[PDB]
């Protein structure tokens, strides 16, 4: 109608631009039949434990930053004293 | 054909808010854009309301603000909400930029969106300064005097630009009038650039944490992602209401409740907290022109990212070196902010210089090297598996 | 820099306004207002608190009107120009003790007594710093000296403040009969100054509680509804039948 | 009431069911039929649609 | 432009390969895409002409298997879980099913990248 | 009876749904006002102006 | 793209939504070969004369009547509040 646009990667429903699919079966259930908050605490606890175990060290070693903060603050306070100017 | 797909305006609404394919596994870090839009709307409304009681002049701005505080009906809510929302804006902006940086969203085909976002960030930073310089307290006066003097670093027409911006020879009535006039206009330009941001993004869709194509599985935005954003909205509301009703002057320094005395220089001349790291970068270099050049580059370097990532993978989900170095850079950023906030003492100068060196090294040396190393290691291990 | 030029750190206290649900102790507010009027209004100025700001907080309408009728103000031109005087009203600010900054500087050596309307919020420390400043006038230590007109106070930045010890024992006689000492009067006047800084504390703290409660309930309900609606996606089953040619 | 329809019908435009009217007017689908399969203590009640106008399902 | 991995340079010296093999094994274990069952070649970007052409020159069974793998990975990522320790991608199945086709397409494109620049030396 | 009547009355048409929402909001505002007023009044015991009037006013 | 837009009456180039045309030959020249300011004065004068003689009274009548009542109203209002008008 309007014009033929450029080359994109989304299209719309039907022609989404994906590859040809074959032999895929998908099931589900109505939201009014499933019980919400079922298998929540167990799954959440297990996932949190796994995430803490695996990506923990990538963040923990905020480790030297706090130490350099503390050392810098302490040394700066010490140098601004009576015995620091000797 | 239904009405929503036939009428022009309803079709415009539907194509962006109701029916729009999205990746089906985007995490909770994809909601910050809606929070940014809500905060911007709140700021626009609150500023429009506040402009009805403010007189932009040297000898009447502070008294007008005080009259707003203690005489206008529910004026404390207005002022506290404006200030606290302006503070939360930069927190959400930093989180948005962090999300865009961690998952490698600057790569094609979303470079134009990245550039538009960078421009919006610069405009927001400029808008924040004029907004905070209006009350004409001690820190506003002295920080404006210091910052607007940086325009003298340009070769030729050096102090002429400063005089033109000041509208005189010092911070007085005309510069407050100029700042009040400009602070009203910039948010509308920001909104227009946000519309451009969204229309540029919509042509290709959002990414996903995995980093692979999401064309195989998609769900419409209307029932699912319009209810996943409500939790974030309510959480942000509960965060901002506590500040507005129990600690309104939270991020606010003690020197911000006094009249602007042009004879008593305060002990420390610092800007608001969200602009501290750039101030530290500026103060790190002993030279003057190099200081402003580095301060500009610290924000302009985000445009060089797409041509600096030599990685076959798109993101840091499956990049062991990237996960480490990203948090290292975040810690360095926090250290830079802390150093910029405090006094320019003996050891702090060395710490700030080292932090600035690391900040400018991370974008220019570390990224290509570790991307190349990861690619090489993975390729070698895969090649040496059959024999 | 050096702590001598930075001032000793203030002392932490506990006040009724610090609690999450508590507001202001109004008897202390009235005592502090009396102390300010009878000991402070000679040199400092509070030209941001009107007479009508006090009715309902520390005084009633009749008491406030009677108190305000004593002072005198200028009341514009009349007939053939001229500048006359009138008795005070219920909508006038507290009378400043000095006309301009120059007269204030001339009277008190060369120092300008700062305005006290927003001095609690404009100092690093809050109520604690002011209270520790008022009750911190000690004899100078060994090796230090004080020039004429300069007093020693460690809490003041630089340990030299040009304000002679303002409060002394039994300076005021409180209406309720509280034994007026330096510490009690200092605490009461600090409370009154803090009220003068932010006079809307009670209402703000009152509405904040209800807002927080409503927001918490809404947040919990929103989380539950999000958990409910997203079920047909988080609980899918995908089976791959291999497409044998 | 719901009725059946098919594009090869001789009198397809003139059928007196609103669904047939809309589908024929907009060429939405090829055909559709209604069924009320019943059992001893249960049953089904629905429709069966066949189409090739992909994108307007 | 494009990834510039230099494994070919390293493989010339057997000393470096023998020294670096355990580090590469540890790095590939640490990257952790096998926990989702994906192959390494499913993570490369497909948004240019070369990759979009290469994906059209794959055998049908390979394309269907890739579609299933990506769908399963997305479904796993929706609910924040990983495959059990028995269904992880074994090293035997982690081969290069996309590199040769992309290399052929790039070679064809590079072939043309010369006739236009042709000059006459006289 | 049971839970069918509740659906039939309130959550059957959109109009009844909205009317119930608005009436419930109108009453919930008053309920929360009363609750917060009671909580605030019990929070401040002996440190309000109306409470401390008989310690200053009467002895004029 | 797609998005299955609505129904309009304009379209675009190539498919303008008009009836099928047949046997309509059209000739035109180049702007660099033709001559501007050629026959402008004559044609413009004839068109203006024809338009004035054709539309004419359509505008002439209402404006004239309005001006007449304007003048009469001004004159009468000036007269009435004078000395002799009130009597
Ligand atoms: C700055 C730093 C943060 C920036 C941004 C980071 C993320 C953004 C935060 C958004 C929060 C979203 C969220 O988790 O809430 C929705 C989340 C629902 O998410 P979902 O659809 O299940 O999928 C996401 C999973 O959480 C995903 O599950 P998982 O498998 O990945 O496991 C993670 C699990 C971890 O679970 C556990 O390990 C806990 C296990 C027991 C749960 C205890 C109940 C918690 C409530 O997550 C939780 O359960 C956390 C929920 C607690 C919400 C916290 C709300 C405020 C925090 C937001 C940021 C805080 C910063 C401010 C700091 C304040 C001071 C400075 O809500 C719930 O957890 C359900 C609550 C049910 C309410 C019951 C009452 C109903 C009455 C009728
Ligand atoms: C029971 C005990 C405690 C439970 C109470 C928790 C209740 C409330 C917390 C909510 C929560 O955890 O669940 C919501 C949330 C729901 O899950 P989801 O959003 O669906 O899952 C996201 C991905 O699947 C997650 O993917 P992933 O785990 O595979 O990936 C790692 C993940 C993060 O995970 C980690 O590696 C860290 C988490 C480790 C946990 C603690 C380890 C400590 C040892 O990556 C990110 O999401 C990073 C975000 C990228 C950028 C955002 C931040 C950057 C800041 C910007 C800096 C400045 C900008 C510079 C640019 C400007 C220059 C001009 O759970 C999480 O995502 C948890 C991860 C941490 C985010 C929330 C952090 C808030 C505080 C929690 C601390 C944890 C202890
Ligand atoms: C309150 C508002 C009330 C009215 C609102 C609507 C009025 C619209 C605005 C009119 C402006 C456009 C217009 O008519 O003139 C453009 C008009 C071009 O339009 P066009 O394509 O000929 O179509 C209009 C025709 O008049 C086609 O119409 P026609 O064939 O029925 O002829 C009617 C003819 C009327 O016939 C005549 O007056 C007889 C010819 C004598 C020419 C009078 C002026 C010369 O009109 C004219 O040719 C008028 C010429 C100039 C108009 C004066 C503008 C005043 C604006 C009024 C306000 O300009 C000229 O024809 C100018 C000719 C000479 C210019 C070139 C000079 C040589 C190079 C300079 C070198 C020096 C260095
Ligand atoms: C698929 O992926 C994507 C998603 O992600 C996954 C998405 O999420 C989204 C979808 C969601 C978004 C993020 C999109 C939204 C974001 C934007 C488009 C950003 C742009 C934001 C704006 C343009 C802000 C606009 C705000 C405005 C205009 C503020 C103005 C407010 C008012 C006019 C009303 C308030 C009243 C005020 C301030 C005046 C004071 C109040 C009074 C009562 C006094 C005034 C009274 C009068 C003057 C009386 C006379 C009035 C008259 C007659 C005039 C009319 C009335 C007026 C007041 C004008 C998209 C698109 C997507 O791609
Ligand atoms: C005050 C702020 C909110 C003010 C109110 C804000 C909400 C305003 C209405 C919501 C937004 C407008 C509706 C948008 C969707 C729509 O168009 O619905 C119209 C439907 C028919 O739409 P359809 O499903 O596409 O079927 C027609 C398809 N044909 C046959 C044409 C091919 O036809 C219908 O059945 C309903 C038609 C009603 C049209 C809107 C009327 C305006 C609202 C009247 C007031 C309602 C009461 C309000 C009480 C609060
Ligand atoms: C400019 C006018 C504003 C706009 C003011 C009017 C617009 C309200 C904003 C939210 C709009 C949400 C639209 C959701 C679609 C919808 O309208 O469906 C109605 C739903 C229930 O829909 P349902 O889940 O499908 O169940 C109905 C079952 N039937 C009856 C059909 C058999 O029922 C609901 O959605 C109830 C939602 C809450 C309605 C109470 C009013 C609260 C919003 C007004 C006050 C807050 C305003 C916030 C503004 C930022
Ligand atoms: C801060 C203020 C925010 C608004 C305040 C809360 C509004 C009311 C929320 C309470 C009721 C929610 C409806 C329950 C679900 C329902 O009933 O309908 C379900 C509909 C989907 O329709 P469906 O057909 O699939 O439903 C199934 C069959 N009927 O989901 C919704 O509509 C979600 C409503 C949330 C409103 C939008 C929130 C997100 C805002 C994004 C901001 C984007 C930028 C904006 C820039 C200005
Ligand atoms: C005894 C009469 C009296 C005089 C004279 C007086 N004040 Fe002050 N005074 C203050 C506060 C608070 C400051 C601010 C100190 C600072 O800025 O560090 C101050 C500071 C001053 C200063 C400025 C000192 C400087 O170095 O700038 C002067 C001058 C001064 N007071 C004069 C509270 C009081 C209070 C308590 C209500 C009373 C009573 C009081 N003052 C009574 C008096
Ligand atoms: C992104 C948008 C905006 C941002 C980031 C912003 C930021 C700020 C900030 C930080 C202040 C300082 C307040 C303080 O220090 O107490 C301020 C003040 C002010 N702003 Fe905005 N603002 C925005 C939009 C607007 C708009 C749209 C208007 C007018 C329509 C406006 C009008 C004002 C006024 C009048 C003041 C002075 C009032 C006061 O300081 O209390 N602002 N702004
Ligand atoms: C008012 C300011 C802004 C608004 C309203 C806005 C709006 C949005 C929204 C709603 C999204 C979708 C959520 C998401 O994908 O994360 C988005 C995505 C994005 N934004 Fe912003 N944004 C703003 C600021 C910025 C800034 C400052 C940057 C960069 C410096 C930026 C860069 C991006 C990028 C790259 C994406 C795509 C992320 C992806 O597709 O994975 N935006 N924008």
Approach to solving? cryo-EM
Q: Kindly list the protein residues whose Cβ atom lies closer than 6 A to any atom of ligand 10.
A: B 30, 33-34, 36-37, 40, 93, 96-97, 99-100, 105, 110, 113-114, 117-118, 120-121, 194, 197, 201, 206-207
Answer whether C25's CB lies under 8 Å from C16's CB: yes
Which chain D positions have a beta carbon within 8 Å of A12's beta carbon? 55
User: In whole angstroms, what is the distance from residue C236 CA to residue C238 CA?
Assistant: 7
Buried b (16+ CB within 10 A) or exposed e, B229-263: bbbbbbbbbbebbbbbbeebbebbbbbbbbebeee
Q: With an 8 Å Cβ cutoff, are F39 and C21 in contact?
A: yes
Looking at residue E89, the DSSP 8-state letter turns out to be P
**Distance of alpha carbon A14 from the chain centroid:** 31
User: In whole angstroms, what is the distance from residue A33 CA to residue B330 CA?
Assistant: 45
**Distance of alpha carbon B37 from the chain centroid:** 13
Best CA proximity match to B320, nearest among E43, E82, A65, A58: A58
User: In whole angstroms, what is the distance from residue B105 CA to residue B97 CA?
Assistant: 10
Decide: B20 in ligand 4 pocket, CB within 6 A. Answer: yes
User: In whole angstroms, what is the distance from residue G4 CA to residue F50 CA?
Assistant: 70
SS3 C107: helix
Q: With an 8 Å Cβ cutoff, are D54 and A12 in contact?
A: no
B229 is catalytic: yes
User: In whole angstroms, what is the distance from residue G64 CA to residue B308 CA?
Assistant: 79
The pair of structure tokens assigned to C58 is: 């520390």
User: In whole angstroms, what is the distance from residue B298 CA to residue B292 CA?
Assistant: 10
- Kindly state whether B257 is in contact with chain C, defined as any CB-CB distance less than 8 angstroms: yes
User: In whole angstroms, what is the distance from residue E40 CA to residue B379 CA?
Assistant: 10
Nearest CA in chain B to G7: B6
The pair of structure tokens assigned to B297 is: 């580059």
- Return the bridge partners of C19, or none: none
Give the torsion through C-alpha atoms of A14, A19, A20, A21, to 10 deg.
Answer: -90
How close A37 gets to chain E, by Cα (Å)? Answer: 13
Give the torsion through C-alpha atoms of B39, B42, B46, B48, to 10 deg.
Answer: 110
Q: What is the resolution of this structure in A?
A: 3.4
Ligand 5 pocket: which of B3, B5, B12 to mutate (most atoms within 8 A of CB): B3
Best CA proximity match to B243, nearest among C208, C14, C120, C199: C208
Chains that touch F (3 or more CB pairs under 8 A): C
Best CA proximity match to F32, nearest among C211, B185, B109, A25: C211
B206 is catalytic: yes
B66 is catalytic: no
Catalytic residue among B5, B27, B181, B202: B202
Ligand 1 pocket: which of B235, B243, B330 to mutate (most atoms within 8 A of CB): B235
User: In whole angstroms, what is the distance from residue B298 CA to residue B304 CA?
Assistant: 11
Answer whether E5's CB lies under 8 Å from B312's CB: yes
Alpha helices, DSSP H, located in chain A: 41-54, 56-60, 64-79
Q: Tally helices (H) and strands (E) across chain A.
A: 3, 1
B149 φ/ψ angles, rounded to the nearest 5 degrees: -75, -10
Instruction: Please count the CA atoms within 13 angstroms of the CA of B259 that sit on its side-chain side.
Output: 16
Answer whether C176's CB lies under 8 Å from F55's CB: yes
User: In whole angstroms, what is the distance from residue E110 CA to residue B321 CA?
Assistant: 33
Please, is D23 exposed, middle or buried when counting C-beta atoms within 10 Å of its C-beta (0-12, 13-18, 19+)? Answer: buried
Closest Cβ–Cβ partner in B109, B213, B346 for A79: B346
How close C168 gets to chain F, by Cα (Å)? Answer: 24
Q: Which of A18, A60, A64 should we substitute to test contact with B (largest number of B Cβ atoms within 10 Å)?
A: A18
Tell the residue nearest (CA) to atom 70 of ligand 1. Answer: C223
Ligand nearest to the CA of B33: 10
Q: With an 8 Å Cβ cutoff, are A11 and G2 in contact?
A: yes
Length of chain B: 387
Answer whether D5's CB lies under 8 Å from D27's CB: no
Best CA proximity match to C123, nearest among C149, C115, C152: C115
Answer whether B282's CB lies under 8 Å from B294's CB: yes
Tell the residue nearest (CA) to atom 35 of ligand 6. Answer: F18
Catalytic residue among B206, B207, B298, B311: B206
B2 is catalytic: no
Q: D27: which residues sit within 8 A by CB, 6+ positions away?
A: D53
C40 known ligand binder: yes
- Kindly state whether G1 is in contact with chain B, defined as any CB-CB distance less than 8 angstroms: no
B272 is catalytic: yes
The pair of structure tokens assigned to A38 is: 């079922």
Answer whether E73's CB lies under 8 Å from E37's CB: yes
Cite the annotated binding site of B for a ubiquinone by residue number: 202
Q: B327: which residues sit within 8 A by CB, 6+ positions away?
A: A58, A59, A62
């Amino acid at each position: 109608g309007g014009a033929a646009g450029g080359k994109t990667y989304l299209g719309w429903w039907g022609h989404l631009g994906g590859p040809k699919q074959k032999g895929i079966i998908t099931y589900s259930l109505s939201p009014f039949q499933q019980r919400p908050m079922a298998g929540f605490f167990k799954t959440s606890t297990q996932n949190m434990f796994r995430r803490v175990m695996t990506e923990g060290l990538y963040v923990a070693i905020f480790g030297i930053a706090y130490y350099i903060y503390c050392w810098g603050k302490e040394r700066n306070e010490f140098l601004n004293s009576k015995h620091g100017r000797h | 054909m239904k009405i929503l797909k036939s009428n022009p305006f309803l079709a415009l609404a539907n194509n962006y808010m109701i029916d729009a394919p999205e990746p089906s596994n985007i995490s909770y870090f994809w909601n910050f854009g809606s929070l940014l839009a809500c905060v911007l709307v709140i700021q626009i409304v609150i500023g429009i309301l506040l402009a009805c009681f403010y007189i932009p002049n040297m000898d009447l701005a502070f008294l007008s603000v005080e009259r707003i505080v203690r005489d206008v009906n529910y004026g404390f809510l207005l002022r506290a909400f404006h200030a606290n929302g302006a503070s939360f804006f930069f927190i959400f902006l930093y989180l948005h930029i962090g999300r865009g940086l961690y998952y490698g969203s600057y790569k094609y085909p979303r470079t134009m969106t990245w550039n538009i976002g960078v421009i919006i960030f610069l405009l927001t930073i400029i808008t924040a300064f004029l907004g905070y310089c209006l009350p004409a307290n001690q820190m506003s006066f002295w920080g404006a005097t210091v910052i607007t003097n940086l325009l003298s670093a340009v070769p030729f027409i050096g102090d002429d630009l400063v005089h033109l911006l000041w509208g005189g020879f010092s911070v007085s009535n005309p510069t407050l009038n100029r700042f009040f006039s400009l602070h009203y206009l910039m948010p509308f330009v920001i909104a227009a650039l946000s519309v451009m941001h969204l229309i540029a993004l919509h042509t290709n869709g959002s990414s996903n944490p995995l980093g692979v194509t999401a064309n195989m599985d998609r769900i419409p935005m209307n029932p699912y992602y319009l209810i996943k954003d409500l939790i974030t909205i309510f959480i942000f509301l509960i965060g901002i209401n506590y500040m507005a009703f129990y600690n309104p002057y939270g991020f606010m320094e003690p020197d911000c409740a006094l009249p602007a005395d042009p004879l008593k220089t305060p002990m420390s001349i610092v800007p608001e907290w969200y602009l501290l790291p750039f101030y530290a970068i500026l103060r790190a270099i002993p030279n003057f022109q190099l200081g402003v050049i580095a301060m500009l580059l610290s924000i302009l370097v985000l445009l060089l990212l797409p041509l600096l990532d030599f990685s076959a993978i798109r993101g840091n989900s499956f990049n062991p070196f990237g996960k480490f170095f990203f948090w290292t850079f975040v810690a360095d950023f926090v250290i830079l902010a802390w150093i910029g906030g405090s006094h320019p003492e003996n050891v702090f100068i060395t710490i700030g210089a080292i932090a600035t060196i690391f900040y400018f090294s991370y974008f220019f040396i570390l990224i290509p090297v570790y991307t190349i190393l990861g690619n090489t290691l993975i390729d070698l291990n895969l090649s040496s598996i059959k024999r | 820099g050096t702590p001598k030029e930075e001032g000793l750190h203030f002392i932490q206290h506990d006040w009724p306004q610090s609690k999450v649900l508590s507001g202001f102790d109004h008897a202390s507010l009235r005592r502090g207002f009396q102390v300010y009027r009878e000991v402070c209004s000679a040199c400092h100025s509070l030209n941001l608190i009107a007479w009508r700001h006090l009715v309902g907080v520390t005084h009633t309408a009749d008491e406030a009107k009677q108190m305000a009728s004593e002072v005198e103000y200028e009341d514009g031109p009349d007939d053939e120009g001229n500048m006359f005087k009138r008795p005070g009203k219920l909508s006038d600010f507290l009378p400043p003790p000095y006309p301009n900054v120059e007269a204030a500087r001339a009277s008190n050596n060369g120092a300008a007594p700062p305005d006290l309307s927003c001095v609690v919020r404009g100092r690093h420390g809050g109520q604690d710093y002011i209270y520790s400043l008022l009750t911190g006038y000690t004899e100078p230590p060994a090796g230090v000296e004080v020039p004429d007109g300069m007093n020693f106070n460690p809490f003041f930045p630089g340990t030299q403040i040009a304000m002679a010890r303002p409060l002394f024992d039994d300076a005021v006689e409180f209406e309720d009969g509280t034994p007026a000492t330096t510490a009690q009067a200092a605490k009461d006047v600090v409370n009154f100054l803090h009220w003068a800084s932010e006079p809307e504390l009670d209402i703000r703290k009152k509405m904040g509680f209800q807002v927080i409660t409503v927001l918490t309930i809404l947040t919990a309900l929103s989380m539950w509804y999000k958990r409910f609606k997203w079920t047909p996606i988080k609980n899918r089953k995908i089976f791959y039948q291999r497409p044998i040619k | 009431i719901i009725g059946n329809w098919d594009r090869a019908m001789g009198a397809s435009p003139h059928l007196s069911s609103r669904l047939s009217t809309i589908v024929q007017q907009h060429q939405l689908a090829n055909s559709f039929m209604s069924f009320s399969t019943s059992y001893s203590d249960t049953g089904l009640w629905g429709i069966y649609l066949v189409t090739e106008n992909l994108g307007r399902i | 432009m494009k990834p510039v991995s230099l494994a070919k340079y390293i493989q010339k010296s057997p000393f470096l390969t023998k020294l670096l093999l355990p580090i590469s094994n540890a790095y590939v274990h640490l990257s952790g895409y096998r926990k989702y069952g994906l192959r390494y070649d499913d993570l490369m970007l497909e948004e240019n002409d070369d990759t979009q052409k290469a994906l059209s020159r794959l055998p049908k069974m390979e394309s269907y298997d890739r579609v299933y793998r990506i769908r399963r990975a997305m479904q796993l990522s929706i609910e924040n879980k990983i495959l059990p320790k028995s269904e992880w991608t074994k090293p035997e199945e982690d081969y290069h099913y996309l590199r040769p086709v992309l290399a052929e397409v790039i070679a064809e494109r590079k072939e043309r990248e010369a006739f236009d620049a042709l000059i006459v030396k006289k | 009876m049971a839970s069918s009547t509740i659906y039939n009355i309130f959550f059957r048409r959109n109009s009844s749904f909205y009317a119930t929402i608005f009436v419930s909001a109108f009453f919930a505002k008053i309920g929360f006002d009363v609750f917060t007023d009671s909580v605030w009044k019990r929070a401040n015991a002996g440190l309000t102006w109306d409470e401390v009037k008989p310690r200053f006013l009467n002895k004029d």
